[PDB]
Structure formats: C-alpha cells, structure tokens
Amino acid sequence: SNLIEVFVDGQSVMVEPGTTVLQACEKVGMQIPRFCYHERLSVAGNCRMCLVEIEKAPKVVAACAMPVMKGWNILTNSEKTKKAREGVMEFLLANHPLDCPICDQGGECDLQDQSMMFGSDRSRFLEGKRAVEDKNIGPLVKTIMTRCIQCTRCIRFASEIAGVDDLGTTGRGNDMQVGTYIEKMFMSELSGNIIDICPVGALTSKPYAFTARPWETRKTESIDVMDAVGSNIVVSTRTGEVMRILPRMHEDINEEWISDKTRFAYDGLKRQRLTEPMVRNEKGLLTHTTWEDALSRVAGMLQSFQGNDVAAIAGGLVDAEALIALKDLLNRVDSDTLCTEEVFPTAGAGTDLRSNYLLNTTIAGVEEADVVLLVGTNPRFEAPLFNARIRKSWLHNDLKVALIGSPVDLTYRYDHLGDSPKILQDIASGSHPFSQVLQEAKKPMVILGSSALQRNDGAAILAAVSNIAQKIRTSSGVTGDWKVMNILHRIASQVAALDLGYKPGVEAIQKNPPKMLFLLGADGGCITRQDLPKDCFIVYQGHHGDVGAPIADVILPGAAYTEKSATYVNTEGRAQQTKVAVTPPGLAREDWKIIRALSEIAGMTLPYDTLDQVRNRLEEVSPNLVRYDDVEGANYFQQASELSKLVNQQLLADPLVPPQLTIKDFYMTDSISRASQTMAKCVKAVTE
Amino acid sequence: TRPTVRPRNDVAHKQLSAFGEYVAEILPKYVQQVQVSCFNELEICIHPDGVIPVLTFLRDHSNAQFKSLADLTAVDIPTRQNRFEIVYNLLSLRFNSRIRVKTYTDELTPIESSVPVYKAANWYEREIWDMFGVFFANHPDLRRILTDYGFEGHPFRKDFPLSGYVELRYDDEVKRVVAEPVELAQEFRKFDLNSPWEAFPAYRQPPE
Amino acid sequence: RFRGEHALRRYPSGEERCIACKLCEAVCPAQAITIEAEPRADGSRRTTRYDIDMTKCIYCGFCQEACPVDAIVEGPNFEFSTETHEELLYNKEKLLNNGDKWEAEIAANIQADYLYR
Amino acid sequence: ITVDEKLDITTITGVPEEHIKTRKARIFVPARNNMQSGVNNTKKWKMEFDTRERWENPLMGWASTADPLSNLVLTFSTKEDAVAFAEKNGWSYDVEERKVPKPKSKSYGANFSWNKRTRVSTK
Amino acid sequence: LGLREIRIHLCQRSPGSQGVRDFIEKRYVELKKANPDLPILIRECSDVQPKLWARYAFGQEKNVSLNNFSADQVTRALENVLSS
Amino acid sequence: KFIWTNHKFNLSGTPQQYVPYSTTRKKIQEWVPPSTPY
Amino acid sequence: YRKVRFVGRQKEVNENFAIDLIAEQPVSQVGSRVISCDGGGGALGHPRVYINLDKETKTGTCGYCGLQFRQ
Amino acid sequence: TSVKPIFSRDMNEAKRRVRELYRAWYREVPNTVHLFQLDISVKQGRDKVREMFKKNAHITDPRVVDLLVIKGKMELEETIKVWKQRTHVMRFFHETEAPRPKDFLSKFYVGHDP
Ligand code: SF4
Ligand code: SF4
Ligand code: SF4
Ligand code: SF4
Ligand code: FES
Ligand SMILES: [Zn+2]
C-alpha cells in the first residue's frame, strides 16, 4: 500500500511515491557520485554530477532532485551515463590550482576520491586557470577561496541551521566569489563546524593547519565532556598526542554536528598541567616529592579525625567511577557531609527517582512537540546542539515558542513573554497571553533551565512550574501520557554524580567548619579558605592548576578525559563510556586507583581492585549505569508533584538573567577552556 | 576493447569448461562445487573426506593424468565457521592444463595426508603444521621446520601479531644468549589506505 | 643514475627546497623517514625534524621519484663506514650539510637524466 | 566412522602468554571519516584492542613501545560470527551497535511556499 | 549509624515485580510524609529479584529480596528496617 | 653560493663525530607551583 | 641532563639558515593581474601555479616558491 | 560433535596416554644434565616437569588433551637427542628476567596499569 514498484538496473525495489532516484538507488546499495547534496541540508542542482541514464528516453536527468514515477528502469551503468560523469568532471578540474603538496585535505578530498574511480584519465586545457584571491573570516577558519568548486554547500548551511545569514553568492558567470562582500567577521557557536561541510580544501582548520596528513592518525571513538548533552567524537592520535577531533554522527544527539567549543579545546589538555605529587613546604612554598612520601602523609590524618570534621566537594568533570571510591571511603568511616559544586534546591525530592531532574522528553521527542515554552535560561550558549534541534524543528513544520526573562538573541522568532518571577505565579492562573495555548496544546513541553534554578528562590520556581506541569497533565493531559516537565544542565558530571546518591547544593559544609577537605570540584570558588576556618589543611586532587591548586596543602595528579576508560551521563540517563587515547604523562595516574592506595595504606581496604569490579559496585547501587544509551519509560511524579507542594517558599524581585554575554562568556568557562590559549586568542578578536 | 587490454580466447574457455564437467558427474560423492576461473583455470571444491580418492582418481587415468604436484598451500580465514583453506594444485604433463583442489577444514578436525599418493608432499605438509597447526593424519615424519625451537604461535595466522613475543639478546651475566619480553625502538606505524566509494560494481555484494 | 648517500637540495638563493608534503615517507617500503612538520612563522610550511636511518634504508629510489618539488635526491657518493650505531641515524641538519658539500656533483647528474623520467 | 558425539565448550590455551585475562577486546562498526562522504568504509564488523603506554625513546623522539598486540584489526562479516571468535580463543569483549540513519523525507520543490516557513533564497 | 537510607529497586515490566508498582501508589506519599530525614533511593531495573538494599553501620549492606509480594506485604516489610 | 670551502671528511671520532640529537620543542610543558610567599 | 652526548664531539650543526633568507630577494614586479611561477627553471622546481597579485601587499611566494613575489 | 578424533576416544585412553610420557620425562631429566654439560642440581629439572603438567588440568574435553600430547610427544625427539645447543633448553628457567610485583601496591608505584 502506497508504494511504486521501481526497477533499478533490472531488479525490483519498492519505494514511497515521492522519494528520489538518489535515495532509491541508495536502497539497493549504490552510491552515485555526489557533490551538491548533503543529507542534513536542502537540495540544489548546481553541479550536475549525478547523471543517471533513465531507460527508454533520449535525455539524461539529475538523480538528486526529481521524483520517481511509475516503475522506471533506473539504468545506472550504461554507455551514456559513463560518457557524462566523465565529461562533467573534466570541467571543474580545469580552473583549479595544482595543489596537493600543501593543501590540507590531501587525504579525503572529493576531487581526488572521485577522479581515480569515476572520471577521466588525462587533461586537455592546456593553459588558463583563473585565480581569485583569499581573505579572512575569523581566527578559526583558514580560507583559501582559490580552490572553490562553487558547490554552494557552505552557503546553504548559514541560511539553514546556524541561522546567521552572512554568506552569499556574488557575481555572474565565471566571475563569482563566495565569501562575505563586506569585511564582516562570521562568528557564532557552530561557526567552526563548516570545515567538515566544505567538500574540497577551501575551508580548512586554523590551529591544526599544518601538522599531519590523515592516513597516519589512529581513530579511537570517545565521548566529550564540556557540556550537558555530552558528545560523540573520534580523537586522532599521531604519536601519542591528540591532533584534532571530529564528529561521529550519532542519530539522536550530534545528528552530524559538533559544538565549536568542543572542537577547538584540545590545546588545554596539554598546555598547563600538573604531573607529580607535591609536598607542603611550610611557607607559601610547595615543592615536588617522590611518590612514597605523600601517601601516608594525608593517610595519617584519616586515623585522627572522625565524624563530620572531614568532607569532600566534587562538581567538575570527573567520571562516575572515581565518584564511588570517594563515597565508599568517606562513608565507611561514617562521615558523609559531601556535596557537588553545583547548586540545586531540594524541596520534597531530588535524590529519589528525581521526577523531572532528567530531561523527560528526549531530544528525539523535541521534533514531535507543538508548543514549547521555556523559562529562566539562555539555551544558546549552553547545550548548543539542543538549540540547533529547536532551529530544525521550528522549520520543516510549525512550532510556537515563548520565553520568560532577559531579551537575548535567539535566531528564530520567539516572543519575550515577561521578565519577573511573578510571571510564573500568574501563569498558574489564566492571564498575560498564550494564557491557555498550553491548555490548548496537543504535545506540550515546558523547560526549566539550570541557570535560574541555582538562585535563592529555587524551591519556589521548582514548585511553581511543576504546578502548571500538573495543571496541563490533569486536564487531558496531552492525548496520552507525553511527559511534560523537564530540565537541562550546564555541568557534565552532575547527573552522573547526583544519581549515585549525593546531596545537591553546598549548604551542609556552608554551615559548619570541618577541618580537612578534598577538592575535586574545584576551580569554581564557592569555597575559599576565608570561608573556611584557619590554616588546617585541604588536599587537592586534579589535573589543572588554575584556582585552588595554589591554595592547597598536598596536590595529587589525575588523568583528564582522554586518558581513562570512564562513564559519563548526559541529560537523559544515557551512559557513554569514554575510552583511552593517551596514557597520562609523567607521574600522573588514574583517579580512582589513587583512592584504593589511599585506602590500603590506611585501615579500611575496599573489596574491589579491577575496573570490572568497580562497575559491579556501580550495578549494586544503580543498575541503569550499565544499560548503555537507553531511555526507559519511568516518570512516577504525580506522587512527587503533590509531595513537592510541602515547601511554601515565595518568589523574589529580580529579572531572571543568565550569566552569558554577547558571545564572550561562551569561550572561557570550565577548566580546559581556561588553559587553552586558542580560546585566549579568539576572545580578543571578538572585542576588537 | 583496445590495446593494453588482455585479449582472451574462447577455445580454452570452452574446453576447460567442457573437460571438468564430468569430474562432478562421475564422482558425486565428494565434489560439491566446481567453478571455472575467467583466466582459463579450474577450481573444484572437495569435501575433506575425499582428500585421498579424488587425488587417487586423478593420479592415474587415461583422460586426466595430472602427475605433477606444483604447489600445496594453505590460507586461514576468520569468519568462515570453518577456518582454514587447503588448496592443492596439479599439472597435466600430457595435456598442458591446471586444476586446483580446494578442501576446507578446521583446526581440530584432522586431514588424511596425501603422503602415499604423492611423495612430493612430504615437506609441504610438515611445513603447514608449523605455520598454522593443521594436524595431517598418519604422517611418516612430523617435525619442526622453518621455526625456532621455542615458538608456540604458528605465526602465519591472523592471531600472531607481526613482531613476536620473544625478542632476543645477549648478556654476560653468565655466558648464555637469553630471551626477553619484546622491546621495540619504534612504533611500527600502521597507515590507513582503504579509501571509500566502492570502485568495483561487478563484484558487488548483495545489498541486505 | 647511481644510488648512494642522501641529500636535500635547495633553490637558488636558499629556500630549503622541501615543503613537507609527506610522500617520501609514505612509500619508503622500510619506514625509515620520520617527518614532523609545523607551520613556520613566516606562513610557508616546512619541516622541523627529518630523520633517515641509514640502516633501515634499503636503497630503493622510491623517495627520489615520489617527490613533487624535486628535493630529496640519492646522491652519488658511497663514502661511508662510521664506527658507531649512534651515528648512522641522520637528522635534518646533517643532510643539508651533506647536501651542500656538493651540488656541483648532483646538479650535473639530474640535468643529464631528467629527460627520461 | 567413530564420530563420538558430545558437547563441550571449545576453549584453547597455551599459544599467547599472559594477555588472555589482562586485555578486553572491542568489537565496533567503523563510522565514516567525516571530511569526505563515501560509505564503503562501513559494512564490516571489526575488532580492535586496548591502547597502552607510548613513551619517548631518549635519543630521537621515536614513540617506542612494548604492548606487542597494538596493531591488529580483523574484519568479520557479521555480529553472529563476531563474538564467535572472542570465545574460541577465550578473551573478554564489549559489543557496539550498528547505526543506520533516518530514512528520510526530503523533497526539492518544497523550498517554495505560499504560507509555509521553508523558503530559501540567495541561491 | 544506623541507619542512613535504603534503595528500592524494581523493574519496569516482567510483572512479578508488581508489588512496588502499587506500593509507590499507596505508601510513598504516605511513607515519605513520615521520616523527613532519610533519603531513600529509587533506581531503575534489576529485571529479576527486585531487591531492597539497606546501608548503615559504617557502610554495611543488608539486602532483602522481595520477589513477588502483595501491596500489603511491602507495606509492612519496610518497617522491619525502618523501626530498627 | 652555500657551497663549502674546500672539502670535509667522515671522521670517526676526530674527536668530532656529529653525535645526533633531537630537533623538537618539548610537548606538555608542566605547570610550576606558585611562589615562596603565600 | 641531555647535553652530555657531545662532550668532546664538537656538536656539528647547520651554519647558514633559510629560516629567513627570503628577504634578500629583490621582490619582482610586473604590473599585471596573474603570473606563473614554475620557479627554478623549466621541468624542475615546483609545479606551475597562478597567483593573484592584487592587494596588500604581495602575491604570497606561491605556497611553494618561497621567493617574495609581488607587483 | 561430528568430527573424528586423533588418537583417543573418550577420557580414558587419553588419561592413560598422558601418564605414559611422564615416565619418559622423569627418566630423561638426569641425562641432559650431563649430556649438555650444564651445572645445576638434578632436583631442579624434576621440579619443572611436575610443575608443567598440573598447568593444564582445567580441560573438560577430548582431542584438546590429545593436541597437547603431540607437542609433548615431539619434544622427546630434540631433547633426548642433541639438537638444542644448550640454550633452547635453558629458556624454561627464567634466570635473567626481573621479578614481577604481582601485588597491587607495588604495581601502583611503577607502571601504568599492567
Ligand atoms: S567553501 Fe568552497 S567548496 Fe565549500 S561550498 Fe563554498 S565554494 Fe564550495
Ligand atoms: S582541494 Fe582537491 S584539487 Fe585542491 S589540492 Fe585538495 S584534492 Fe587537490
Ligand atoms: S622532499 Fe618532497 S616528499 Fe620529501 S618532505 Fe620534501 S616535499 Fe615532502
Ligand atoms: S632509498 Fe627507499 S627505503 Fe631508503 S629512505 Fe629512500 S625511499 Fe626509503
Ligand atoms: S549531483 Fe549534486 S546536484 Fe545533481
Ligand atoms: Zn614559484
């Protein structure tokens, strides 16, 4: 029912009435040569490089953009097709410079992996070769527009997803260029992602630029942690060093796109790094030590203190395996008092079943929604790929989007509804329009961001939006279940950390003065020694030395994110194990194995040694940390929403402002952002 | 088609088609596939029980002598559910023709050795034992040829990484010449040369 | 057309004719060459390290003929026989010295023989 | 005859030294070096091993190493015969998944609208 | 101490676990109305033998295995540990 | 131009024997602790 | 730590440098639009590439050629 | 299991065959200690053999045991004769190679997870 039986190469196949010759011939396993067609873009017909000879016809058509009628004989290999592909791809290889000694796409470029397989055998021009000039765009994208097969693929990118309409087509005939007519710089998030799109060596990387050819790298897949959704990358080592990283095209997150910060931040891995254990020396001095001095040094103080005078904070980018060796060491001594760096208010729940603390509609359900309301967040500069999914789903079907607080620049036509916490209280009632379109919605979606919930009125706004999430779901609600209330984040290892059974928000240490703290937070200054009591020690365990490692007693090294098999959890409860790329330099070690040799030199010895025994200890506590990349159906929060009505805190008087600047707050955030000097070199080119 | 392209002939493509038609007709206990190579050669698949008789049928006859064993070899293939591949090869000295005998096998399943039929395959069978581990049955002399006295890997198969485990050296700690764990002074870079776009349309796998 | 000691030529007034295009290292059958480039400060790309073992060198003539910019040349002098294995490893700044001890020798050879290849 | 039917799990030992229990293998589908667009690099399940240390040889900078496996890719045809090789030699493993994209709905000529939102320019 | 918390595991389906799927409906909002100190955890899927961990006394484990109770047996088998 | 003066030699230890070395920058550049004051 | 390998070995290193020996070239001028540089003589040197010389303030040494080229 | 065996049938001819060749090696320890002019104590050479046969006792299958026989049967060609020039025999006794830690804390000082 509803298909056309179409014969490719004299062999039947059944396609929908309305597909292409391209996709139908790609169903029986053939690749016609493609230039002007990428899947995640629109379709143009401006290179004429798919030329199928359709049977019983004089003419030759483009298989990129035409429907498939009643059952043709799509005749791919003939003697008129092969006279066309060979004839089109002698044209563009004429007006073209004679590089591949020095052009940087010398390994993959598609004037080269066509032109052995398809295409001609020799050249007949024999002099000419027009030569246009280059220019600059930014300090990310080296631009040599001499090369330029003029496929108009980078230009349809900008009018699409990355909604800055900046590039164009300037000229007539052979005389045309591509780049921006005025000298405007083109820079946003997703700005460096065009250098994958560009099918020849025109757009190429600036920091990587002249280092290594791509038949030598060793691709090992991995997951990146600088952000909420995680990533899907593939690192590329040459001789034990990271050269550059790519996207990996997972079908739900990173559809094919990667974030710009996550691409150009491998320099911070190897610039300013701590390699060895260091001893106290009694002044502001702090000097290196051999590995068997500073082990029983701190392990001496464990046998002395007891009770709540020792604690630990951890809220950065460490995994969910070096956050079990901490929890079973501080709670076999029965002194828990430990929290993450991030502030998250708990009112009736929060550690138990979490009820909205994971993003309940997944990313694949965002394309199914109809009316999206979101409050208290600037979604552009935190989880940008979730923003691009809105940008896709705002197009290609209808969508209606409103926002509360702080008029900012989102690329699609939203409307600033109001700017106060009191808009939330009135929208529980019927007023201040759209007013009932949430009630008149078929698949609603109400996002709270984690930028507003960090504030002092967090227990109010948590219960306020859960009321209107209750108000919609008790009406019908949707059809249907269609989980409504949800949240995102901006710190990667929090959902991994919190669903081990920690507490949210640094409050327990904020009241009492415990003596010794372990810092794995750490660079955010929510605790200083001034807020601490006097010069009683704190022992630091990390890999960078930005803020908190100069103010420390004994520091211990660790491996960052490309050096250890780990586990991280994005905002849907997936579990994405990163893998080994480089072994960590110097005397640095893995994080969770320095804890056992802290344990075994002290009294208590933990009943697990290898990494498989660690993950069974995970499977004891949480059984969904080995169910890799699966989103189970479990909401259970009708009980939670009434029980979260227990706390009756009210709102405040302040506009829900995000921390983010025009762009400039996007670059320098976490830890690896800070030490990476290319972020330091692309930040002064913004301000000028 | 043109110059610098090999001219074929249909003479040998018809005779070697017609000849080995009746090697499957008159021994249909063993022969389970016969196919004609496009460059005028013959392959004939034989169940490993017919290792001795279909040689012995060939070994002496009036219509197919094949009295010279040119090459016994062996190929290993993971993902086949029966690993190896034993390939015999013979020469009709009266007739100027070639035919290959491709008998599949496994590790633990022995093969009846072709020692009595041809005395050429005495050394061609001690060798394959050392390089893969195929145990040829009732061999009159099975030993250790082409390897050292300490290898236990059977190295020409896909599970033995290229450099060994036993990189050797000397020391004066007594007098001896002693082994060690393997210790390279360079990585042995592994390049990547397998380029996309599926350049060969004729040999194309079924779509699935 | 004799094969022997290695060299790196350079242009009239010097440019270090190499451009680090990474082909003389991809068709050494014996994996002798070891190149690590970097964008040099002027903007044109060059080598930093260049290493040819003189023991793994099996003396093909596959470096000599893969080069587009016509730089690395098997030079015609069999003068050798050093006394330490620590020495036969070549750096970049040996080859240039060894490639500018003569170019009156080499450039008389290549001008005679480039007409065939 | 003497065909002696029974059932016992085939596990082999003796040939490597100690790398049976130390190393967990990894089976994956390779996925499309994204700087180009040809999809012949897919369609074969492979396996690949762990990575270990690479120090520096303190005379040049050659990244010398132990870890004698370090360069082994095998090409298996399917999942069904993927795991059937990690058991017969008897080492651990972990299995990835094959990912094939959305089917999907694209139509040139929908780029020009009367009241819809997909309408492109600058072409 | 004892104690600190407990860990209610279950499965989403394979309906032998259906005591907890009524126990949340009956005694969670009545259960956690009492004890506003103890952060009892709920996790995802054991898929078989839906156990119930307890953790106290310098980090020691006590695991009952309710496989298939009623809605009233799970109502009363929790205060075995909650009282103690 | 760029030709040598007269000649040279391949002298095994003259005392000069060229003794090959590495020609790169160091890679990771480890972080140094703060100063002697606090 | 590393410098002991050339104690009494004279440490033979390069003398001339071409890190910048470009600059002594009298950078050529033409008064045209695009120029060829198969520099170093025909059938030797780098392949022929056509450079645009219209801007601030030179061709760009061809990418291959090294020699400062301009109008 | 449709495959013919090598020598044995099932668990009994095999586990009398492996006890046969042990009496060969027990006899042919004190011969090679003077046939190669190697100076150790003779009880060392008997300790290595009774060490080696206990290594493989986890087998629950025939014709795998029979495969180890063929290796064990072969070595008595070279060892009882003179084909190994004093050096291929002495590789079983790892005298040169440094001791491995094999305990957790000693690995942690030296070596990135061996
Ligand atoms: S940058 Fe060059 S290759 Fe890419 S779309 Fe523009 S003209 Fe085409
Ligand atoms: S972009 Fe194409 S034509 Fe230009 S150098 Fe690269 S492969 Fe050659
Ligand atoms: S001589 Fe040629 S191949 Fe060798 S480094 Fe220079 S440009 Fe590359
Ligand atoms: S002669 Fe051959 S093997 Fe030797 S360096 Fe040149 S290309 Fe490599
Ligand atoms: S080939 Fe891309 S437009 Fe038809
Ligand atoms: Zn030039």
Swiss-Prot record, chain A:
It is an enzyme of class 7 (translocase). InterPro entries: 2Fe-2S_ferredoxin-like_sf, 2Fe-2S_ferredoxin-type, Mopterin_OxRdtase, Mopterin_OxRdtase_4Fe-4S_dom, NADH_UbQ_OxRdtase_75kDa_su_CS, NADH_UbQ_OxRdtase_ferredoxin, NADH_UbQ_OxRdtase_Gsu, NADH_UbQ_OxRdtase_Gsu_4Fe4S-bd. It catalyses: a ubiquinone + NADH + 5 H(+)(in) = a ubiquinol + NAD(+) + 4 H(+)(out). One of its GO terms (cellular component) is mitochondrial intermembrane space. The modification N6-acetyllysine is found at K56, K471, K681. It is found in: Mitochondrion inner membrane. Keywords: 2Fe-2S, 4Fe-4S, Acetylation, Electron transport, Iron, Iron-sulfur, Membrane, Metal-binding, Mitochondrion, Mitochondrion inner membrane, NAD, Oxidoreductase, Respiratory chain, Transit peptide, Translocase, Transport, Ubiquinone. Pfam families: Fer2_4, Fer4_NDSU1, Fer4_Nqo3, Molybdopterin, NADH-G_4Fe-4S_3, NADH_dhqG_C. It comes from the Eukaryota. PROSITE patterns: 2FE2S_FER_2, 4FE4S_HC3, 4FE4S_MOW_BIS_MGD, COMPLEX1_75K_1, COMPLEX1_75K_2, COMPLEX1_75K_3. Binds 1 [2Fe-2S] cluster per subunit. [4Fe-4S] cluster 1 binds at H96, C100, C103, C109. Residues 2-80 form the 2Fe-2S ferredoxin-type domain. Gene3D superfamilies: 3.10.20.740, 3.30.200.210, 3.30.70.20, 3.40.50.740. Residues 80-119 form the 4Fe-4S His(Cys)3-ligated-type domain. The keyword Cell membrane does not apply. Its main location: mitochondrion. [4Fe-4S] cluster 2 binds at C148, C151, C154, C198. One of its GO terms (molecular function) is 4 iron, 4 sulfur cluster binding. This is NADH-ubiquinone oxidoreductase 75 kDa subunit, mitochondrial. It comes from Bos taurus.
From Swiss-Prot, chain C:
This is NADH dehydrogenase [ubiquinone] iron-sulfur protein 8, mitochondrial. Its cofactor is [4Fe-4S] cluster. [4Fe-4S] cluster 2 binds at C28, C57, C60, C63. It comes from Bos taurus (Bovine). It is found in: Mitochondrion inner membrane. GO terms for molecular function: 4 iron, 4 sulfur cluster binding; metal ion binding; NADH dehydrogenase (ubiquinone) activity. Core subunit of respiratory chain NADH dehydrogenase (Complex I) which is composed of 45 different subunits. This is a component of the iron-sulfur (IP) fragment of the enzyme. Interacts with RAB5IF. Residues 9-38, 48-77 form the 4Fe-4S ferredoxin-type domain. Its EC number is 7.1.1.2. The keyword rRNA-binding does not apply. It is a peripheral membrane protein. Keywords: 4Fe-4S, Electron transport, Iron, Iron-sulfur, Membrane, Metal-binding, Mitochondrion, Mitochondrion inner membrane, NAD, Oxidoreductase, Repeat, Respiratory chain, Transit peptide, Translocase, Transport, Ubiquinone. Belongs to the complex I 23 kDa subunit family. It catalyses: a ubiquinone + NADH + 5 H(+)(in) = a ubiquinol + NAD(+) + 4 H(+)(out). Core subunit of the mitochondrial membrane respiratory chain NADH dehydrogenase (Complex I) which catalyzes electron transfer from NADH through the respiratory chain, using ubiquinone as an electron acceptor. Essential for the catalytic activity and assembly of complex I. One of its GO terms (biological process) is mitochondrial respiratory chain complex I assembly. [4Fe-4S] cluster 1 binds at C18, C21, C24, C67. The keyword Nucleotide-binding does not apply. Binds 2 [4Fe-4S] clusters per subunit. Its main location: mitochondrion.
Curated annotation (Swiss-Prot), chain G:
GO terms for biological process: mitochondrial electron transport, NADH to ubiquinone. It is found in: Mitochondrion inner membrane. It is a peripheral membrane protein. Keywords: Electron transport, Membrane, Mitochondrion, Mitochondrion inner membrane, Respiratory chain, Transit peptide, Transport. It comes from the Eukaryota. The keyword Transport applies. Its main location: mitochondrion. GO terms for cellular component: mitochondrial inner membrane; mitochondrion; respiratory chain complex I. Coiled coil: none annotated. Belongs to the complex I NDUFS6 subunit family. Mammalian complex I is composed of 45 different subunits. This is a component of the iron-sulfur (IP) fragment of the enzyme. Accessory subunit of the mitochondrial membrane respiratory chain NADH dehydrogenase (Complex I), that is believed not to be involved in catalysis. Complex I functions in the transfer of electrons from NADH to the respiratory chain. The immediate electron acceptor for the enzyme is believed to be ubiquinone. This is NADH dehydrogenase [ubiquinone] iron-sulfur protein 6, mitochondrial. The lineage of its organism: Eukaryota, Metazoa, Chordata, Craniata, Vertebrata. The chain holds residues 51 to 121 of 124 of the full protein.
From Swiss-Prot, chain H:
It is found in: Mitochondrion inner membrane. One of its GO terms (biological process) is mitochondrial respiratory chain complex I assembly. GO terms for cellular component: mitochondrial inner membrane; mitochondrion; respiratory chain complex I. Signal peptide: none annotated. It is a peripheral membrane protein. Pfam families: Complex1_LYR_2. Mammalian complex I is composed of 45 different subunits. Belongs to the complex I LYR family. This is NADH dehydrogenase [ubiquinone] 1 alpha subcomplex subunit 6. It comes from Bos taurus (Bovine). The lineage of its organism: Eukaryota, Metazoa, Chordata, Craniata, Vertebrata. The gene is NDUFA6.
